[PDB]
Each structure stands twice: as structure tokens, then as C-alpha cells.
Amino acid sequence: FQNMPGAIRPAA
Amino acid sequence: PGAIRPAA
Amino acid sequence: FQNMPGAIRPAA
Amino acid sequence: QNMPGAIRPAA
Amino acid sequence: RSVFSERTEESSAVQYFQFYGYLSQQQNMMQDYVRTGTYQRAILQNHTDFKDKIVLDVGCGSGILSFFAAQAGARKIYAVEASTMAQHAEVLVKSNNLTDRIVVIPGKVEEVSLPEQVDIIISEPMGYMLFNERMLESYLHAKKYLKPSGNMFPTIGDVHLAPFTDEQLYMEQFTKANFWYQPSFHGVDLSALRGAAVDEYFRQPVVDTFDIRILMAKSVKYTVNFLEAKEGDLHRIEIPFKFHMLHSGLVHGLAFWFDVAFIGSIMTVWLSTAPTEPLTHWYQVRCLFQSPLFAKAGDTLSGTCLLIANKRQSYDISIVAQVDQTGSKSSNLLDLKNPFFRYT
Amino acid sequence: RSVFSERTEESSAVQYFQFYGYLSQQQNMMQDYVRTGTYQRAILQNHTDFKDKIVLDVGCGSGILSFFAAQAGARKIYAVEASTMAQHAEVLVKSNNLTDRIVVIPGKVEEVSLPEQVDIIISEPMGYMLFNERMLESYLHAKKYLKPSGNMFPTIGDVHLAPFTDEQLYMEQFTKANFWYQPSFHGVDLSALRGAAVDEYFRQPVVDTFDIRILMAKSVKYTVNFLEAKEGDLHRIEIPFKFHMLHSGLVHGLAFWFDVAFIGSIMTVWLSTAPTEPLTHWYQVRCLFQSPLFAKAGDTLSGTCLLIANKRQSYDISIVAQVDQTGSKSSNLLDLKNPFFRY
Amino acid sequence: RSVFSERTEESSAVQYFQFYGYLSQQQNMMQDYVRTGTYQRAILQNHTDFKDKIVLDVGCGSGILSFFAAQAGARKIYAVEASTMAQHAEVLVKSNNLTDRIVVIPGKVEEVSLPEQVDIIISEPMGYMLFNERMLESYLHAKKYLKPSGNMFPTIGDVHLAPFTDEQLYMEQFTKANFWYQPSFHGVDLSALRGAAVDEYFRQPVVDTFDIRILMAKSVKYTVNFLEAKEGDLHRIEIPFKFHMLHSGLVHGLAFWFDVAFIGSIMTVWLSTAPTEPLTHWYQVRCLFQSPLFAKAGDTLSGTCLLIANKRQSYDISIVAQVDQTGSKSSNLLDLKNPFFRY
Amino acid sequence: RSVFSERTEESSAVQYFQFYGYLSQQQNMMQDYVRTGTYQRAILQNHTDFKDKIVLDVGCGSGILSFFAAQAGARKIYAVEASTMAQHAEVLVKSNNLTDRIVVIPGKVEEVSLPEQVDIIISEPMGYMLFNERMLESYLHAKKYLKPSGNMFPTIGDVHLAPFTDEQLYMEQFTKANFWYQPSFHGVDLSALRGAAVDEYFRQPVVDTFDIRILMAKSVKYTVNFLEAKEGDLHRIEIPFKFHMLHSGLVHGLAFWFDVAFIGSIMTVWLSTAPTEPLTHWYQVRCLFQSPLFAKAGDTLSGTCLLIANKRQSYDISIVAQVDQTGSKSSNLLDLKNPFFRYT
Numbered sequence A, C: 001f002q003n004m005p006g007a008i009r010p011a012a
Numbered sequence B: 001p002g003a004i005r006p007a008a
Numbered sequence D: 001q002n003m004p005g006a007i008r009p010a011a
Numbered sequence E, H: 001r002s003v004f005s006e007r008t009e010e011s012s013a014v015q016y017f018q019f020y021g022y023l024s025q026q027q028n029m030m031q032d033y034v035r036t037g038t039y040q041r042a043i044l045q046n047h048t049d050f051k052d053k054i055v056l057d058v059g060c061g062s063g064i065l066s067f068f069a070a071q072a073g074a075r076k077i078y079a080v081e082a083s084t085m086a087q088h089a090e091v092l093v094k095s096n097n098l099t100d101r102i103v104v105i106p107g108k109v110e111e112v113s114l115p116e117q118v119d120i121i122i123s124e125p126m127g128y129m130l131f132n133e134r135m136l137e138s139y140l141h142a143k144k145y146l147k148p149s150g151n152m153f154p155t156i157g158d159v160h161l162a163p164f165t166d167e168q169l170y171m172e173q174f175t176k177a178n179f180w181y182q183p184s185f186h187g188v189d190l191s192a193l194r195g196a197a198v199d200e201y202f203r204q205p206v207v208d209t210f211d212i213r214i215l216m217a218k219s220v221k222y223t224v225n226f227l228e229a230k231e232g233d234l235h236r237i238e239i240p241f242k243f244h245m246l247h248s249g250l251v252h253g254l255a256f257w258f259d260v261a262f263i264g265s266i267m268t269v270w271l272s273t274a275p276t277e278p279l280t281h282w283y284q285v286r287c288l289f290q291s292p293l294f295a296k297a298g299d300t301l302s303g304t305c306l307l308i309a310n311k312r313q314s315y316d317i318s319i320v321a322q323v324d325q326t327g328s329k330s331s332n333l334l335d336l337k338n339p340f341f342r343y344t
Numbered sequence F, G: 001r002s003v004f005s006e007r008t009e010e011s012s013a014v015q016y017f018q019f020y021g022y023l024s025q026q027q028n029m030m031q032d033y034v035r036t037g038t039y040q041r042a043i044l045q046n047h048t049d050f051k052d053k054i055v056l057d058v059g060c061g062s063g064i065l066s067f068f069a070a071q072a073g074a075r076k077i078y079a080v081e082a083s084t085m086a087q088h089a090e091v092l093v094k095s096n097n098l099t100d101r102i103v104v105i106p107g108k109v110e111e112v113s114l115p116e117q118v119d120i121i122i123s124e125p126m127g128y129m130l131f132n133e134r135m136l137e138s139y140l141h142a143k144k145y146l147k148p149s150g151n152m153f154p155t156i157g158d159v160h161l162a163p164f165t166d167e168q169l170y171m172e173q174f175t176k177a178n179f180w181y182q183p184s185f186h187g188v189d190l191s192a193l194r195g196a197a198v199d200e201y202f203r204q205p206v207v208d209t210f211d212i213r214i215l216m217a218k219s220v221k222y223t224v225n226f227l228e229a230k231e232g233d234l235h236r237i238e239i240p241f242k243f244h245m246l247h248s249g250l251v252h253g254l255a256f257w258f259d260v261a262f263i264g265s266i267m268t269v270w271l272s273t274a275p276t277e278p279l280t281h282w283y284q285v286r287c288l289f290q291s292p293l294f295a296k297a298g299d300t301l302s303g304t305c306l307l308i309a310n311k312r313q314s315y316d317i318s319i320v321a322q323v324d325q326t327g328s329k330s331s332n333l334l335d336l337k338n339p340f341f342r343y
Ligand SMILES: *C/C=C/[C@H]1O[C@@H](n2cnc3c(N)ncnc32)[C@H](O)[C@@H]1O
Pocket: E004, E017, E020, E058, E059, E060, E061, E080, E081, E082, E083, E085, E107, E108, E109, E110, E124, E125, E126, E127, E133, E135, E138
């Protein structure tokens, strides 16, 4: 994914 | 998460 | 060397 | 490893 | 005020067209060779349907489909795009010396004004599970510009449903939810939210691919004829199914894929996202039952998948299934807008 | 029209709090043991700062930080959360029999009402690159409820900037953009958009971790003292830098990470996201130059990183950098709200 | 007035024959054992084609091929060489006691006066990619001295073309050209020349060897029958092609190699420079596309390779290639005289 | 017709400027950071020599030195270049918005016309061993455009000579030439050409680098003052030497390197190609003796290096040397135009 416009906080 | 089309 | 303008045959 | 026509050596 | 405005929350529309304003996302779709090559094949191999014809391209994006229509000899092509990608489409039109043949019209097809009727409409209105994005309605809405004897590429869309067995996918939901089932997470008892975590995971459709051997019955096909259908036909989509079980085992949910056909004068070309075909950027979609259903080979799995359109440019999915020979029932309610992208 | 409403577009807020309404996202953050374990260490080891105190928890989420305050002896904890997660937090307060000490106030900290001033504010307002989410302003805004001489947990935040070299990353992103260099993609000339594609790809910050060996100079530090700063201070952040290059090679951009300090009365506890420390869900952030700068060990790289807050709860980042010895200059503009998650 | 000078720029010929006046260059070609051993094999194995015959050696250099013809029993060998190497060949003829059979005649074969018509012409007129040097035209020109029953050694030439994929080679060249993409080299913006740089670098054919697994389709073959061809046949060489792709992937260019056959009376002896065969000082040659074409196994890649002879004793190469299924087209112009010797 | 054409054979000039028409060869020189960086430091740190001055750039190539002169504040810069690179320099002047300060004049400095005299000449006229290319004469020729009391960057040039011992380099010549010393190479006796092969190898100067510990005496220096010298002074360059040997051993030849100094109003900046300094694309140059000379520490090695300009834009090199204490003598003749590049 080059764009995750809704992921405020990255996956741990 | 806002991704309308999945990444190919 | 990127340009060997006088080299006619490659070195064996 | 001759340089015929190469006026300046490769850096 | 417009058809699109009336059915879409503004906050959803903003996010939607901001996503499509990225060249990286055009690139994502363009690099899908199955998608891009098939559309080109459909248009060029049916050149008689485009030669000297007027064409409307709904949601053109970077304009590729309009260029394919131009390669097939179209006289004039109206390319409609509501995202800021319309800006980049114009650049490509000029640099490709096709300003005389392609007119980019920025805006929503439900709100722009075309100067004349068209002979054929082209578009890629398919989201994952076909219906997501609710762009099929914009495609059908564009028929107000179509001559009575006009065509549409694609001409029909087929959504396929089939029961599947994936024990690991099902048990994975509880393994994730059981994070909350501990009495002392740093001294805190989290167990009271475990049930809410479970329900949350089961509302998510799963977007990925799978081996066709997990399928336990021939798919059921719900066809949408884009030449006959109205926008209203997609506000409520009731798909009844009665599967003839080919294998015995536990059915954990339904698998979804779709095909579209370009029915041209010379030939018909098919673009399929089926699991038996090369993978695409649409992948496939699976919706779990809240509880599995044991079905013997030869039993019938009957029920209904009801897709209710919402103002977030997607659908709420209601699935009810039962084995007729036993009366065992299950169901689930899923939110198609927020799926879990499980492919690795 | 609250302070939050005036600085945030509705569309951004809806998506923002929708993300935090998911239990799976709470799990995500909670399972970051460095993050959660470090917070519990800061609170419990500084238990005297909480014993019989009044506490405000800004953006409590599921309430995990309120429970830590409760374990440390707090008298009353007002836990404010604007997402629907506030309902789940209330469930945990009841199931853990702490209703007499944790009071969930649903809503935005800029809009809710508290019945009394608090002795100490706790929160996790750090986004990636620290400043993302613009929640530091909500954290600072909450100080209107802080008594004189009240404490802040975290107390200060340090942003670190350092130049890096990473040809692989640079060619990875450059290769993607060069798709729009094709003159005949299915017969179509895309080259006219090559410039735009490059711009788009290189204004995406890259979120992931890296080996410290890619860093070419000692980091420059920029400190925000939460006890002192007003939210107005975060509307336009200017970070000058003057790096003394330790290695020769190409500078492909600047790397960012952050530390926060919990300056309690018993001990200071640090939570660091540096590439030398165990990895956290914040990772690190790198901003690429469209064309790298060549620098020799001993040169100075000078410029300014300017962060301008936007209405999408993020920042537009301007980086201008210059090799002083040769005058080689690079400028980039980055959209912190839309990064590339590369891990 | 001579055919040679009419088609050759003075400055090119002076440099050309200077290169061949060096004994170090003769040694280089002579130590290529595949080349030298195959020539001796073709001549000695067909000794009856030389026994008691009159021979012309075009461009004899130090005279090695003339000595092979003498070993096979030739009655008289006229050895024509236009470089100063002719004087060294004379020395070797005397020191080998072959003054009664090898007559060195210095000068260009288009300009010397040969005393007698010959039964067979021997030569090594092959340049890299076969056609460089335009010596094939001198070889054909010399047939004015050939009897009607005469023979040519080599008798035919096969040039092979095949599409290849080599991302490393493509990036290597494009990285060099991207130097001219810098907006601030020592504070100077070079980017306005980025287009001209890419043209220059990809104007260079790449001379080296490669693994055969990079080839994506069976080669096309273009044949020159030296016994039948006229000089003018080599001024414009048109090689159409239609490749059936055996693998999917990016086609970065076309790869070239050549075979020559010595069609004697006793047997045919082949001298191959194919990548499947032992390496020679000719190596192979690859012409890069500025932008590769994507092809799927089963697609057809068709187009034309056009070689236009120039006054610098080489060819301007035009290559247009098209993926028929998608219309992805690529066109490049290459200066065969100035390649990149990558080995 | 011009000073240049009368001293240069056409075939040499054609190849010469074709080589410099390649952007890859400008790039080759520009990437030499010692070379490019020192020129920029020499110009910018002597900014008072350029601020509001008129500048002539001889052999500007891509124009980089002209841009440095502009960075230093030059009022006007005339950039002369004879290769087709002049066209690319013009593009760069336009794209850098300097058309009002830099004028590219395509042509040989001996043949172009300048509208006015200049205050300073800048150039990089140094070939390997300094004198190769015979471009120093064009640099001196350009002084017809220099005001009285004008300056030149570089201002002076020092060539350095020093004897060296390198047994392996010497023996390598015979290893290569002994290819010809075999009685039956494919049936052919090649031995009669061995001597000619040896001579050919010894006529080649060796372009590479070396450890400074192979030098056996302090270098001798020959200086060209570009402000005073005339073109004719470079047609016959006699360099007498009297080396006082610091180490005992076999002297196999003479090593060459050069420095140039930019003597500005503020400071002097040095560009050095010495083997004690960072390597440049000029490397160093070594000329073998046909026979080594044994010398003891304290002995004197005297002789002359005579450079005779030729019409191939280079020099024929005559070196003769003798050990005074023994009379042992050696010599060699070398063609500077065709060196052997030995650096790996
Ligand atoms: C799946 C493809 C989406 C493309 O079509 C554009 N698009 C969606 N919805 C509309 C409407 N109503 N009008 C015009 N263009 C539309 C998307 O922006 C994307 O390019």
C-alpha cells in the first residue's frame, strides 16, 4: 500500500 | 483504512 | 572509460 | 588498457 | 444538490476523491495488466463500435480508457472525472496531441453538462465485491446521455457467490479477540470487552485470495445488465442462493467475486476476478458466518445475501443461510466499507 | 465553535476518530510493550506524583493510562476521550471496580467540562514524527484545567533530525515515480506527468526503521516543553539545523525520531523512538530529497525544517538544506498526513 | 577517387589505421585462441582449396592468415594491409623463409594494384556486431580480383538478434545519465540537459558478454552471402523481426551476435560469437531502449533494425520495436562507432 | 588560416573535439571533486577578482567555471568552447537565468572574436603531465583579450620530475613483448618482431598512481608563468635535472606530476596532482628508461627531459640521464599522445 489515508497510527 | 481500491 | 573513440576492436 | 582517443583519463 | 450529493455523506466523498487524486493510485490500477490489457482488448477488438463514434468515459482517471477509445478511431471522447486527477488527464490529452478528439470535463457525472448524446459509454465502475464505491449507479446514471441505440462497455456485470470452508480464517478471529480475555493486562482486567472485539472482527469482510479447493459448491450468479438497469436497482440488492453442496464439511462463510462482459458487435470480451483466474487488484472477498454450518455433500445451502446501500459509498451486507436437510441456521451483518485486507 | 472545531476540517475529524473507535486499534497500540510498559513505569515509579491526586487523562482511549494512575494511588481520574472508545473504557472501569476513582468524560478535551482543577495531566499525544495528529495542541489546551505548579506526563518532547544516506530507499521511490516516464504505456505517452509523479512520491514521508549506520551527522534536537508551551506555538514550528558531516557521501534526506520525558518527583523516565532503541509502533520517519546532495566529511549542511500545521490534523513540512562549502541546495515539501508505511 | 576515400572521412581513416599499426593490438587479436585457432582450422582442414592456388589476404595485419594459407600449400599469397603493420608482416615473411610465396602489398585493397587474379580471398573483415568498421565492403570490393570459380573465406555471415532483459545494465546506464538531473550541482542547475544525457548514454551500444538466460525469445537471423553480395548491399541494411516471446518481463533491448562460415570443399567450419559459445574479443553487443517494453509470454515483438552506413566507418542504428498486443512502441538511435566497452 | 589550424593536423582536431562533445566526458571531469571543488574555492574565495569584472572562460565545456565566476559576482562572462558542448552550455545558461551575464561563444579561442577586453581569464588547460593537449598555448593565446594588469586563473603551473624505482613495472614490458619470442605460434616464428614490440611498449608513458616511497630523489620543478609566457615558449620545453639520490637502487624512469596556483587578490589556492595528495583524474605520469641506472645514495643523476610539441596536440618526449659518478647512461623516446593507462 502506497496510500493508507486513514491510518492515523502505524501498525505495531 | 481509506483505501478504496486494494493495492495490486 | 565511457568513451574510447579510437578503439576499433575490443580487448580480448 | 590503451586509451586511444581518450584525451582525459577516467576519473 | 444532485443525485450524487443526495446519497453521499460529504466526509465520505472528500476521502473518496482524495484517494483518487494520487497518481500512485492510478498507477496501481494501470499496472494491473489483467485489468488494463483486457479493457484495451475489448475496445480495440470491437473497433467498429468506436470508429467515428462519440464516446463518454465515466470516471476516466488519468484518461487511459479514453486513449484506448481514441486508438480505436473514436471521433470525440468526453472524459469525465470528479477527482483532481482530471487535471492530469488534460495534460496527457495535450501531450498526446488529442485535444481535438478528447475533451476532459472535470466534475461528477451527475453534475456536469455534456453538449451532446453519445453512442457508447465506457467506464471502470467496479469496486471490490463489484458494488463497493457505489460507482455502478454513476455508470447507470450516465445513460441519460446515451442514444437509444447506444452501447455500454462493460455491458453486464456478474457477481458470484459460493460457500467456502476455511477453519483457520474462522479461528483467527477469536485468536485476535482473545487478546482482551486476560485478567491482568498490566494489572487491568480486559475480559469485559472480548465480546465486543469478536463482534468487531466479524463485521469486517475479508479482502484477499484463496485456493479454489476451499469452495464447496458451484457459485450462484446475480447478473446486472447495465443496458437495462436503473440506478434504483442497486439501492437494494437481494441475492437469493440455493447451493448444491459438492463437498461435505463446515461452511464458514460466502466467497464473492465478479465478472464483467464487453458485448461488442464483433466479439465479447470477459474480465474476470474469479479465484480460478489470474489475481487482480480486486482480489476476492469473503464474509464469515457468525457460526459454521455442517453440510453433507448433496445437501442444499439456502438463504439470502442482502446488500443495502448506505451514504458512505458502500453497502451493509446481510447474509442468512441454513442447511435445508437439518434446519441449522446462521447469519452475519458486515460493513463493506471497512474490510480487513488480509493478503500478504 | 470550539478551538478544535476551528482548526480541524470535519472530514478529517470524522476519519480521525473513526480510526480510534476500533478495539483492534487499541489492541495495536496496547500490544506495543515498549509504549505501554514505559508508560506504566513512568507512572508507578513516580507514584508520589499521583497518590491522592486529581488526574486528567487526555485521549484515554480504552483507559489504560487511567488504570495506571489508579494503581499509583490517584484519588480521582477524569478520563476524556472523543472517539466511541469512551464507551468501552466505561465498561472496563466498571468491570475493574474503579467507578469511585475513574470518571470517563466523553468528548473533546476542548469542549468538555470538568468539575475541578487537576494536579497532573497524563496523555499520549505523540503521533509519528511526534507532531502528526496535532494532538499536542489538545494536550497543551488541557492545561486550562491544570492547577498552578501542576505536572505534565509526558513533561517534555525532543524531536531529533539527522541526515542519512540510503540509495536503496531513494531508488525504490524514484523507480515508482518513473512509471510516469514511460513514453508508450499501451501506446500512451505518460512522460508529461513524470515531474508531477516525482513531486507526489517524494512528499510522502517514509515510516519505517533503519540501521543507525545510515546517519551522517550528529542529530540536532528541538525541544517542546509541555509545561511552558501554548498551543499557538505549534502552529508554525521552525527548526534550524547546521550539521557537521561525519562521513562523505550522498545525503538523501533527513531522518526524524522523538523522545518524551516523564519528569516525575522520584525519577525521570524516558520513552524514546530512536533507531538505537527497541522499535515502537511509531517507528522512525525519513523525508527524502528529490535529488540528493553530495557532502564531504567536515562539511556543514545548513538549512531549516519548517512545519506548518494544516486543517487535516497534520503538518505540511518544508525542508531546505544546503551544503555550505559548494552551495549545493535542496528543497522539498512533504505532506505528513499521507506517508508511505514501508515496514 | 578511390572507393574507400569516397565513403570514408579522412580523420576517421587516420585514427582507424593508427589503431591497427600497434603490435600490442595484433597481439590482442592473435591471443584470441578461438579466433586464431578457428581460422587455422578452416584453412588447413580445407587445404585442397589452397594447394597450388593464388590467394588474396585482405587486411592481413601481421600476416597470420597468409602464413596459414602457406601451410595449406598456396602457390602465391598477396597480403594487402593499409596500416603500418604491413612493414612488420614483411619482416615475418623474411624471417620465416616465405619470401617466395607471401608478397606483402601495402595500401588499401581499393587502391593497390594486384598483379594477378586470385582463386580465393581470405580476410577477417568482422567488426563488433559484425558490421562495424565497414570492412565487409572492402572484402566485397576485393572480388574484382577474384576468378569466377573463386571462393571466399569467410563465405557467409549470420547476424543474430534477440530481445533481452537486464535491469542491472539498464539502471547502470540510466544512473550515469541522471547525473544531469541534479538541480544544484555545486549550485548549478543541470536538469535542462537531462534529456540530452539520456539520449547520449543510450546512443551507446554495450559491448560485453552476458548469460543466455536473459534472452526472452529465439533469435532472428540476417544472412550476408559474401560470394554473392555487392558493396552497395551494405550501405542500408534492413532487418525486420517478429519475436514470439517465451518469457514474460521487461524487454530492455536487443542483443546482437554473429557467426561466419568458411564453406570449403572438404568441410564447413563455423566461427561463432554467440553467447552460448566460448567468448571472443568480439564479445556480444546490446542496444538498450530508453524505456523497456513490457511483454507477456506468447506476445509478439515486431519491428525493424535499420543500419545506415556513415563516413566514420560504421553505422547509424535505428531500432523500432512494438509489442503488437498492446501497441507499446520503442524507438532508439545508436552510434555504433562509439560504444560502451563494459567488460 | 588561424594559429590553431597551423599547429594542429585536422584528423587530430576532429577526434579531439568529438571526445569533448560528450556529456559523459564533462561529467567525468565534473565528478572529480578535487578538480571542481578547488576551482570553485579558488574563484569564490577571491571574489574581489571577479565582482563586477569582465571574464573570459577558455574551453568552458559545459560552462561550470563560468557559473562559478557568476557566483562570485562577475558583470559579464565570455565562455568560449570549440566542441559541440557549446550548445549544451548555452542551454544551461538559459535554464539558470544567466543570459544577461554569460555569453557562450562557440569556436576556437584562436578564431572567435570578442567584443571587448576582459579583466581575468579562467580556464582548465591542463592535460595529463600538464602539457598534453597543447591547450596551454590556447590559454596563452587568449591573453590578446586581457587588459593590462589583468589576471589569470590558474596563474602559474609547476611540473615536477623525480626518479623512481619500480622493478615490476619495468619487467612487465618484456613479459608483454615476449609474446612475440616464440618459434611456432600456430606454426609461425614470431621472434623477429620481439625487439619492435619492446620499443613500442617503452614509447608509452604510463598513466597511473604509485606509492611515494618509490621516489628516489627530491623532485625538480619547472614553472610556467601564464602571465608572462608566450605560445612559442611551449614548442620546445627543456627541463634540465640534477637529482641527488636519497636512496640506493635501480632507477627505472622519471615520474611526473603538476600543480597550478590561482594567485588572487585575497589568497592563493593550489590545485595539486602530486602523489602526496588526493588522486585526481590526471593521476600521475611515469616514463621508463630503456635500461635502468644503478645509483647509490649521494650519487647525482643528471640529464634533461626535452618536450617537443607535435601537430597531434601533444609532445614527443626525449629523456636522457646519466649517473655522474659512474658514467652509466640511459635514454628513451616517448609519445605522450598514446599513454598506457595502468591504474586499476
Ligand atoms: C473505480 C474507479 C473510480 C474512478 O472514477 C471516478 N469517479 C467515481 N465516481 C465518480 C463520479 N460520480 N463522477 C465522476 N467520476 C467519478 C473516481 O474519481 C476514479 O477516478
